[PDB]
PDB file of C-alpha atoms and ligand atoms in Angstrom:
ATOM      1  CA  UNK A   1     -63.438  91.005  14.336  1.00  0.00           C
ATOM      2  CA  UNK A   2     -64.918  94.341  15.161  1.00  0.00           C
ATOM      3  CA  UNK A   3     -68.173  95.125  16.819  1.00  0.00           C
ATOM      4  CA  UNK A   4     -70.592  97.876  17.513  1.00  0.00           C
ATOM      5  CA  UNK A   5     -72.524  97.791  21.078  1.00  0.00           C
ATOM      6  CA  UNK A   6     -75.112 100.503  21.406  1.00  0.00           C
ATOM      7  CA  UNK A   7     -78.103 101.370  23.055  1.00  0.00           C
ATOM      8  CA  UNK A   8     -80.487 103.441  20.959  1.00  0.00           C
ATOM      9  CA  UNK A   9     -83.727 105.239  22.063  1.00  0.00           C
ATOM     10  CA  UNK A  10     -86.597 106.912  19.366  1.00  0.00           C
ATOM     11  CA  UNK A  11     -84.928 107.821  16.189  1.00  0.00           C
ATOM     12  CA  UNK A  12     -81.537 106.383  16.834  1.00  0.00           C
ATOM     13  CA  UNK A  13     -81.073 109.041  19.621  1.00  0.00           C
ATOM     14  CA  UNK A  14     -77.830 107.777  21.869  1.00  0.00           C
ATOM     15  CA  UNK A  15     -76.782 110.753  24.355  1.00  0.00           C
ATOM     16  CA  UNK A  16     -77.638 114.518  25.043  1.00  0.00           C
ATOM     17  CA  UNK A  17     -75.491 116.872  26.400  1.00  0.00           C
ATOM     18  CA  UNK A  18     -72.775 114.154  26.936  1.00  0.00           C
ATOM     19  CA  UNK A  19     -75.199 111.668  29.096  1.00  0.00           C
ATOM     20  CA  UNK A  20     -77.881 109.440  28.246  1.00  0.00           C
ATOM     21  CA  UNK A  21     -81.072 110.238  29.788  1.00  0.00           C
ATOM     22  CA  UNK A  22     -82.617 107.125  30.724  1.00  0.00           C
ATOM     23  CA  UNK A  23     -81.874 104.944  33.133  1.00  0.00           C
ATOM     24  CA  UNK A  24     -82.196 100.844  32.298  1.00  0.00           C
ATOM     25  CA  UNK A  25     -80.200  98.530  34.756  1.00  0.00           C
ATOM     26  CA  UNK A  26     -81.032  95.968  32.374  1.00  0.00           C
ATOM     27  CA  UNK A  27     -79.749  97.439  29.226  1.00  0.00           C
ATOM     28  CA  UNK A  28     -75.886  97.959  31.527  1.00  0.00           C
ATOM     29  CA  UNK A  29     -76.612  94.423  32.470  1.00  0.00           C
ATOM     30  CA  UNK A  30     -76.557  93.533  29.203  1.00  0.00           C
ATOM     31  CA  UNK A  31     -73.315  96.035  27.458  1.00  0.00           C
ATOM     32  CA  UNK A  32     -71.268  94.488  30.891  1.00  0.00           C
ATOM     33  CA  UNK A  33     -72.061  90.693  29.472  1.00  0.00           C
ATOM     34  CA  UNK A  34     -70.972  91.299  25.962  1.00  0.00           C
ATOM     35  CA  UNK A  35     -67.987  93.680  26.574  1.00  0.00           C
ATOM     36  CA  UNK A  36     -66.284  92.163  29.821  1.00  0.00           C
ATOM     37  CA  UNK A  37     -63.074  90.467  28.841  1.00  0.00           C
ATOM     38  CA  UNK A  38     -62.550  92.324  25.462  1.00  0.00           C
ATOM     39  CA  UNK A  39     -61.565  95.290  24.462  1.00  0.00           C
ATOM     40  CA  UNK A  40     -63.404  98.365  24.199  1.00  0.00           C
ATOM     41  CA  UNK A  41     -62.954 101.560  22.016  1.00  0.00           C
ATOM     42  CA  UNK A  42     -63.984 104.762  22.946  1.00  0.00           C
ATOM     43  CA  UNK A  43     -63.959 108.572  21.806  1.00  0.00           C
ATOM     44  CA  UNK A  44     -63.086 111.219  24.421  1.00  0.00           C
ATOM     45  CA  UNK A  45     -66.576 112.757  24.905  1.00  0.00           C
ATOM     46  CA  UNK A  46     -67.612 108.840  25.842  1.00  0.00           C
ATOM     47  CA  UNK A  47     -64.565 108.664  28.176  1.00  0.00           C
ATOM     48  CA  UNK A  48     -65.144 111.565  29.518  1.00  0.00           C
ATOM     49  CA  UNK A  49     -68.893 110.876  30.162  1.00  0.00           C
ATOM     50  CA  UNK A  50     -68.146 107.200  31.869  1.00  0.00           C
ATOM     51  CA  UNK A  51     -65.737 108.972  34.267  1.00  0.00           C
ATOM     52  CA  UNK A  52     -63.636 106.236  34.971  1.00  0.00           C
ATOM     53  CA  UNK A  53     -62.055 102.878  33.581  1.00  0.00           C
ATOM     54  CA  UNK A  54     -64.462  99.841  32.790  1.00  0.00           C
ATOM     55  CA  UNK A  55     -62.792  96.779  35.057  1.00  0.00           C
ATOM     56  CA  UNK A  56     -62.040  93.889  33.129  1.00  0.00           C
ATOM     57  CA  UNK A  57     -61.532  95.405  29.962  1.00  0.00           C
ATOM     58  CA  UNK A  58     -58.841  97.000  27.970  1.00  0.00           C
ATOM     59  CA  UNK A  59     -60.060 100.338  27.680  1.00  0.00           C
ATOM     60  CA  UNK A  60     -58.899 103.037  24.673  1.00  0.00           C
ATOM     61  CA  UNK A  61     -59.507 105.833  24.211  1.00  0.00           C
ATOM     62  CA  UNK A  62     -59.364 108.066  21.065  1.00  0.00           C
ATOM     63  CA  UNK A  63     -58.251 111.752  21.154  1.00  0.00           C
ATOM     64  CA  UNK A  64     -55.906 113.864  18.473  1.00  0.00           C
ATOM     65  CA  UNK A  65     -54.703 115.211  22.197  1.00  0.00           C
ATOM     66  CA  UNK A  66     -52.405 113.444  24.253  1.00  0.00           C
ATOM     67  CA  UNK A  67     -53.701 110.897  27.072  1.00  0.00           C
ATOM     68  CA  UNK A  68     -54.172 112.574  30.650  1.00  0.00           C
ATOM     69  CA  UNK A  69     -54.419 109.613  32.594  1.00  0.00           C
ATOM     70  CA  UNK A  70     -51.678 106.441  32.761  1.00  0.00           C
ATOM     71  CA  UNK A  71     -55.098 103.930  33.692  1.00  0.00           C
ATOM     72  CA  UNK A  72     -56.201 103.479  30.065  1.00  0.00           C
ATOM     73  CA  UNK A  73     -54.226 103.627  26.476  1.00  0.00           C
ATOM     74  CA  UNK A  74     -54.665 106.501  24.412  1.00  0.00           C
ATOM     75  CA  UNK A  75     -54.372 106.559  20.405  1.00  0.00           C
ATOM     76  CA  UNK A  76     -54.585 109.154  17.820  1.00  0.00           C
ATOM     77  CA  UNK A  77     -56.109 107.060  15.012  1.00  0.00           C
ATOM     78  CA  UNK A  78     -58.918 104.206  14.443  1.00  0.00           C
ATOM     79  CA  UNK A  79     -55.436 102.132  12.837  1.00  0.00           C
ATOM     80  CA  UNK A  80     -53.834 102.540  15.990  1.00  0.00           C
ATOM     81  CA  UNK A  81     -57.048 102.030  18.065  1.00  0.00           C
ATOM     82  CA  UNK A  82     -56.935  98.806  16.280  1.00  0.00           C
ATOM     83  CA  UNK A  83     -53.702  97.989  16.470  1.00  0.00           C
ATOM     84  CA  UNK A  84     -53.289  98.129  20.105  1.00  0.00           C
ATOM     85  CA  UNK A  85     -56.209  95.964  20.810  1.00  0.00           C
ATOM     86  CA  UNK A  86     -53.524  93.285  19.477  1.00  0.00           C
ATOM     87  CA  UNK A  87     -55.038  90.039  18.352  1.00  0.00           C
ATOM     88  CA  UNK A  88     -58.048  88.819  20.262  1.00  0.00           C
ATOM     89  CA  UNK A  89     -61.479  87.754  18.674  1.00  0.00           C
ATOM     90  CA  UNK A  90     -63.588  90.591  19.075  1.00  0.00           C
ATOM     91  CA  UNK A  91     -63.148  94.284  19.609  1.00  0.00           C
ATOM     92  CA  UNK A  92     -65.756  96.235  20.554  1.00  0.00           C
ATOM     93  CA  UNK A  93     -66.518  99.514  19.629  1.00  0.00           C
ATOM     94  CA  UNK A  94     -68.657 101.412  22.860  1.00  0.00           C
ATOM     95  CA  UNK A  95     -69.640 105.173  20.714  1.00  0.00           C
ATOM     96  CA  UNK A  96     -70.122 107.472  21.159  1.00  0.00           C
ATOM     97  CA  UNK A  97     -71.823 109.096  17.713  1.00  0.00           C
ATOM     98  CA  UNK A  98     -68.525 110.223  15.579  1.00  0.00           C
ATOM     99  CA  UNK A  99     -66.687 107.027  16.785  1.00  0.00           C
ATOM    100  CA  UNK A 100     -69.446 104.591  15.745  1.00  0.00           C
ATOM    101  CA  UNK A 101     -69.619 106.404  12.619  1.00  0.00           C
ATOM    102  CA  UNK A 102     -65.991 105.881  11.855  1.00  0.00           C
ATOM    103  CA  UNK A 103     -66.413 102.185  12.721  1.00  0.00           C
ATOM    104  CA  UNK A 104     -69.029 100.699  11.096  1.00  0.00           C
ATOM    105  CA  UNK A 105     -67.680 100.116   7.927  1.00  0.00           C
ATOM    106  CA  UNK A 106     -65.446  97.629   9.576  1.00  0.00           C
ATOM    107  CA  UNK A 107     -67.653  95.957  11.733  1.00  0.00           C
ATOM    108  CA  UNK A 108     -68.793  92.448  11.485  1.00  0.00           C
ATOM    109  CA  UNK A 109     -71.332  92.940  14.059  1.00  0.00           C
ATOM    110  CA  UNK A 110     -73.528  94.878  15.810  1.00  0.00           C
ATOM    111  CA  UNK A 111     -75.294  94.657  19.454  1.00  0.00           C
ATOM    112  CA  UNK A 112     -78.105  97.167  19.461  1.00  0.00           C
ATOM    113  CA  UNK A 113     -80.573  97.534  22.413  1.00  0.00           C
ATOM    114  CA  UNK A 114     -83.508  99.297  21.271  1.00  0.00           C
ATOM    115  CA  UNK A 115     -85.571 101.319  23.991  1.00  0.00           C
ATOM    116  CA  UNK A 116     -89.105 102.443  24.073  1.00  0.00           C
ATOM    117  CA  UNK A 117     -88.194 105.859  24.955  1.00  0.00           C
ATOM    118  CA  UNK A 118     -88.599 109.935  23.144  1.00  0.00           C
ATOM    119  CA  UNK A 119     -85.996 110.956  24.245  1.00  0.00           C
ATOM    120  CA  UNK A 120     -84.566 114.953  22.646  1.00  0.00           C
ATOM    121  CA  UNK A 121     -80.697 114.567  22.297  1.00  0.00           C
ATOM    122  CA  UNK A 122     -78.177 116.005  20.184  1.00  0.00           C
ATOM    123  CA  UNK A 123     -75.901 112.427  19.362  1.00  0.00           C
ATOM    124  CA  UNK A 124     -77.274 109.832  16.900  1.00  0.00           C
ATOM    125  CA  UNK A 125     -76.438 106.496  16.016  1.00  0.00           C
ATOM    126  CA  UNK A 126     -75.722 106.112  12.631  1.00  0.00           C
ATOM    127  CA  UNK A 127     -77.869 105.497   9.571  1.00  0.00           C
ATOM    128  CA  UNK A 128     -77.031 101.990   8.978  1.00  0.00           C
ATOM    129  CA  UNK A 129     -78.256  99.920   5.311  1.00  0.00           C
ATOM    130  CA  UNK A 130     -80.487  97.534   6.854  1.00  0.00           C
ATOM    131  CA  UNK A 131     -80.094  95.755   3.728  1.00  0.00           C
ATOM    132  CA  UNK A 132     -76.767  94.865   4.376  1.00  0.00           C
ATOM    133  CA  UNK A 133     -77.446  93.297   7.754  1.00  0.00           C
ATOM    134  CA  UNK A 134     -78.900  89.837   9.231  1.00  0.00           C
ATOM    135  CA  UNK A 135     -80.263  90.130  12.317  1.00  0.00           C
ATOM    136  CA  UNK A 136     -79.341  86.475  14.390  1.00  0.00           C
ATOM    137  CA  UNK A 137     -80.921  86.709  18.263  1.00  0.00           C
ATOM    138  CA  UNK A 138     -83.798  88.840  19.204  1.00  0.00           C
ATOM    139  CA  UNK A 139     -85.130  89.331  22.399  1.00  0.00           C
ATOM    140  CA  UNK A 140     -87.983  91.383  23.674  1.00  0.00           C
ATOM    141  CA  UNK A 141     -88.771  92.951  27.465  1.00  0.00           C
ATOM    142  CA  UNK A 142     -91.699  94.740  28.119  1.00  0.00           C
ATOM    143  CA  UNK A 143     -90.440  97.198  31.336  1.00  0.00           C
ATOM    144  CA  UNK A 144     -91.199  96.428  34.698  1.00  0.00           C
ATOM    145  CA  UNK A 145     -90.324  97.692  38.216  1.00  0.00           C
ATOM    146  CA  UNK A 146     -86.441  98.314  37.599  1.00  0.00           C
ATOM    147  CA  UNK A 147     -86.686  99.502  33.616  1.00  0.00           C
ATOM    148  CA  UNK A 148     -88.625 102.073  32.935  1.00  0.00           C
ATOM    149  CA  UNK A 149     -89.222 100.954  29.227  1.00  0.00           C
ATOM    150  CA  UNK A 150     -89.425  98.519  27.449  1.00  0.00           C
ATOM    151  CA  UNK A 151     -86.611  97.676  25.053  1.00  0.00           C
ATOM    152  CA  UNK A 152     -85.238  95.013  22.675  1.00  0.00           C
ATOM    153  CA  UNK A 153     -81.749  93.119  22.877  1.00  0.00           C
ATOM    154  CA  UNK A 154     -80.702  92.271  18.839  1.00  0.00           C
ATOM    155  CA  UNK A 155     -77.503  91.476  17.347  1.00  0.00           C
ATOM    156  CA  UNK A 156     -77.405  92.047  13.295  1.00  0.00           C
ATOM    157  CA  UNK A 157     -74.275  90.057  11.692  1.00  0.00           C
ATOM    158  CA  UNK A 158     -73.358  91.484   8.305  1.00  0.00           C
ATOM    159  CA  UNK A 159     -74.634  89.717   5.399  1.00  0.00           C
TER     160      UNK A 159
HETATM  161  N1  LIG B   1     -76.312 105.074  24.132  1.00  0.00           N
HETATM  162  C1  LIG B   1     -75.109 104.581  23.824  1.00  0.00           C
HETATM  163  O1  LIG B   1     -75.026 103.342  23.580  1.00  0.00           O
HETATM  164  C2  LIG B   1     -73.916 105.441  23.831  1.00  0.00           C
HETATM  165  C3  LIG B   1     -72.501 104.802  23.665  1.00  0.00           C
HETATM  166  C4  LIG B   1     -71.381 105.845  23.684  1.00  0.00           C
HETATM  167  C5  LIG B   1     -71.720 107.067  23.844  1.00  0.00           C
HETATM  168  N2  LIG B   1     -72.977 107.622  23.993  1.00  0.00           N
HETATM  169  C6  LIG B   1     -73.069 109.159  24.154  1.00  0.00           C
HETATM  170  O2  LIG B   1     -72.531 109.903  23.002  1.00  0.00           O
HETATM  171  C7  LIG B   1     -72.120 111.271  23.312  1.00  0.00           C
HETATM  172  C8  LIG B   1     -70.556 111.264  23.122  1.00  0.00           C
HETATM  173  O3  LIG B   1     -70.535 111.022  21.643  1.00  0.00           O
HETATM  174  P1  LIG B   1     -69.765 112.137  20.785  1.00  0.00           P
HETATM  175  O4  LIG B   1     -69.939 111.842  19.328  1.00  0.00           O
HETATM  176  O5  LIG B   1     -70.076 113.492  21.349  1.00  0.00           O
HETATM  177  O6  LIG B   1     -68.183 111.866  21.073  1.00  0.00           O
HETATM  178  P2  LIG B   1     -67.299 110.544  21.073  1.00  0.00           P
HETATM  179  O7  LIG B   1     -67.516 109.902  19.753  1.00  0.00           O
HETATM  180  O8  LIG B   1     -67.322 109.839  22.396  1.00  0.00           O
HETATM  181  O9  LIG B   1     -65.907 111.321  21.150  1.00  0.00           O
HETATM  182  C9  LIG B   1     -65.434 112.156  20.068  1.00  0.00           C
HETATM  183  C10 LIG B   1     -63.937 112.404  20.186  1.00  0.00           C
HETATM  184  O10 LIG B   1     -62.995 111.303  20.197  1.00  0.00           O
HETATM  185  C11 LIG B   1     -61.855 111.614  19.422  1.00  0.00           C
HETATM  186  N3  LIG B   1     -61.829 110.915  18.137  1.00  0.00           N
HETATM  187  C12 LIG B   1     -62.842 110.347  17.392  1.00  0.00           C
HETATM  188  N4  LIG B   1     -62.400 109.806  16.252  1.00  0.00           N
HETATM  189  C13 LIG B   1     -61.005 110.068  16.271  1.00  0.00           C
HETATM  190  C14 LIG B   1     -59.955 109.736  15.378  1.00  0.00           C
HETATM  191  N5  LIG B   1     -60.164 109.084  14.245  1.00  0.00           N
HETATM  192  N6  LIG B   1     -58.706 110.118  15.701  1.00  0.00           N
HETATM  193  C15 LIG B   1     -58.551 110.778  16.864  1.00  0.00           C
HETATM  194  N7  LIG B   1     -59.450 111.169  17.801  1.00  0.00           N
HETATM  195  C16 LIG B   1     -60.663 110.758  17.430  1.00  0.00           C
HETATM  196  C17 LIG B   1     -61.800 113.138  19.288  1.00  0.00           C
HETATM  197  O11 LIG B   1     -61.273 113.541  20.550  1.00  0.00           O
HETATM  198  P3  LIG B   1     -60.429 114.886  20.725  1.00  0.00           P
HETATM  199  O12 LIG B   1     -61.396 116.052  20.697  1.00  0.00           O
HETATM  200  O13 LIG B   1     -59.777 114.866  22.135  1.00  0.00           O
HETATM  201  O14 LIG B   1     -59.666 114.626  19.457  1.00  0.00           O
HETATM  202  C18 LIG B   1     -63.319 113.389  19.193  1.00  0.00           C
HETATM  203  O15 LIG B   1     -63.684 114.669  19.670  1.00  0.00           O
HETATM  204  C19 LIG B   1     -72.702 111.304  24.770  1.00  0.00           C
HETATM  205  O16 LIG B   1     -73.937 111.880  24.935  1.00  0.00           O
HETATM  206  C20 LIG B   1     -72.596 109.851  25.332  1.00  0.00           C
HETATM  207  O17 LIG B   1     -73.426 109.907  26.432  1.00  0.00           O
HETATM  208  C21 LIG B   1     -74.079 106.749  23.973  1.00  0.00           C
HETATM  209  N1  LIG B   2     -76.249  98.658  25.125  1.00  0.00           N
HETATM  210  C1  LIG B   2     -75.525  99.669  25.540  1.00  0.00           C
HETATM  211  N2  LIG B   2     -76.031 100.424  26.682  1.00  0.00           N
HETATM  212  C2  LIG B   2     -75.391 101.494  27.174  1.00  0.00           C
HETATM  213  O1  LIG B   2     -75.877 102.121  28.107  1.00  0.00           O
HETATM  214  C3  LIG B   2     -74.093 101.886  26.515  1.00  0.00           C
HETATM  215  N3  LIG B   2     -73.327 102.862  27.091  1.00  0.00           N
HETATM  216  C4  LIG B   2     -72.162 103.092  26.512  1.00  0.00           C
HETATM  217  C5  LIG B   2     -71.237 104.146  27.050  1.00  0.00           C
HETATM  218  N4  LIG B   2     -71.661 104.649  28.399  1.00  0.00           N
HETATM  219  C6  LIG B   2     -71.464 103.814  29.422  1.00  0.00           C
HETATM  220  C7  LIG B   2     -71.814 104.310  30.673  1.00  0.00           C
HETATM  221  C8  LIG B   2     -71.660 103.528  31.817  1.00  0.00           C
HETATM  222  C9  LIG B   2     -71.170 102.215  31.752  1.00  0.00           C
HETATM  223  C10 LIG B   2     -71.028 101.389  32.959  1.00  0.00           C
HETATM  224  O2  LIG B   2     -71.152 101.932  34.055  1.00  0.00           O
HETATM  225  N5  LIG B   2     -70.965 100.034  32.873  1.00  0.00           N
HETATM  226  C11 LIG B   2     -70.703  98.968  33.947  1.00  0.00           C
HETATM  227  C12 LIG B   2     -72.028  98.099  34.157  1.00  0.00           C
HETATM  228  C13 LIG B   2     -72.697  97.969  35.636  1.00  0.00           C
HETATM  229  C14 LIG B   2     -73.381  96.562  35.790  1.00  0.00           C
HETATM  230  O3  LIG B   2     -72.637  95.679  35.286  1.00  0.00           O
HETATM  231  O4  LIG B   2     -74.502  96.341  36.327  1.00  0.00           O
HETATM  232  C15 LIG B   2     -69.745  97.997  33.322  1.00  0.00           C
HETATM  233  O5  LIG B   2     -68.920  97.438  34.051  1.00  0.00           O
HETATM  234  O6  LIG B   2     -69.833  97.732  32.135  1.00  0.00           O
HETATM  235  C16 LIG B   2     -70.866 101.744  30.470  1.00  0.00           C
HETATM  236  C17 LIG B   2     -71.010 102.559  29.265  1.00  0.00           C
HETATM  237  C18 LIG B   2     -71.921 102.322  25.375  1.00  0.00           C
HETATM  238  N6  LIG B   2     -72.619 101.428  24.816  1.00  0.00           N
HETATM  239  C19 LIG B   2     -73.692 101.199  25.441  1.00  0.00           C
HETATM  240  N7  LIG B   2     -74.337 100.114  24.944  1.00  0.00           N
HETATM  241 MN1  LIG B   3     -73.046  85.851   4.817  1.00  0.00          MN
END
């Protein structure tokens, strides 16, 4: 199945200028847990913005322009994105905005953080129908000496 991991700050704000501002060792704690030992999909600007491959993971990356670098897979289409994940349980979809948006018609599942933080940026999650989701595991943190904010862990399974 397919899956959307995000973090998202006021108003579904997830990057500006190619970074994200904040800084939450919790939150990476957290995307490394639920990603390591999958596969994870990616757009350019987000593989550009990581800067290098994610160990323990297969990592893709989607471009229309060919791959520049033999230590991930490249594909020109979400089909092929999918396809070369070959069959495992879970695929997970890492952003950034036009990726995600591409995505979440397919996905089964989504793992959102949400952060106490106003944040100005120019990349938003998507507008996702609430309706059409179930939210299954909660988890509040109020922030503390190494997070800044606070910020909720949720996963939303589609109805
Ligand atoms: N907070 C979070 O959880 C989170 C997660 C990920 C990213 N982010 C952030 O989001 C921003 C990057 O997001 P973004 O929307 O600018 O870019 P992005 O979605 O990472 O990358 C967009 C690019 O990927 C390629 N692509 C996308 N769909 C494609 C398709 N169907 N076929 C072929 N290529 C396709 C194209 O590359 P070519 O131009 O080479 O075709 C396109 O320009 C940053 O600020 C990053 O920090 C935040
Ligand atoms: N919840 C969530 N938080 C994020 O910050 C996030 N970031 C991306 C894309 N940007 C990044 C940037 C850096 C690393 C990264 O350095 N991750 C290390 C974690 C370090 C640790 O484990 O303490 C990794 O191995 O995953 C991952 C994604 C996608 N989804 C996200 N999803
Ligand atoms: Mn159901």
């Amino acid at each position: 199945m397919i899956s959307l991991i995000a973090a998202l700050a006021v108003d579904r704000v997830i990057g500006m200028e190619n970074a994200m501002p904040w800084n939450l060792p919790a939150d990476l704690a957290w995307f490394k847990r639920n990603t390591l030992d999958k596969p994870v999909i990616m757009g350019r600007h987000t593989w550009e913005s990581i800067g290098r491959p994610l160990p323990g993971r297969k990592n893709i990356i989607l471009s229309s322009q060919p791959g520049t670098d033999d230590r991930v897979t490249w594909v020109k289409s979400v089909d092929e994105a999918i396809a070369a994940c070959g069959d495992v349980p879970e695929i997970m979809v890492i952003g950034g905005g036009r990726v995600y948006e591409q995505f979440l018609p397919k996905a089964q599942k989504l793992y959102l953080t949400h952060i106490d933080a106003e944040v100005e940026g120019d990349t938003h999650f998507p507008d996702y129908e609430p309706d059409d989701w179930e939210s299954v595991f909660s988890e509040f943190h109020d922030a503390d000496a190494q997070n800044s904010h606070s910020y909720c862990f949720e996963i939303l399974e589609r109805r």
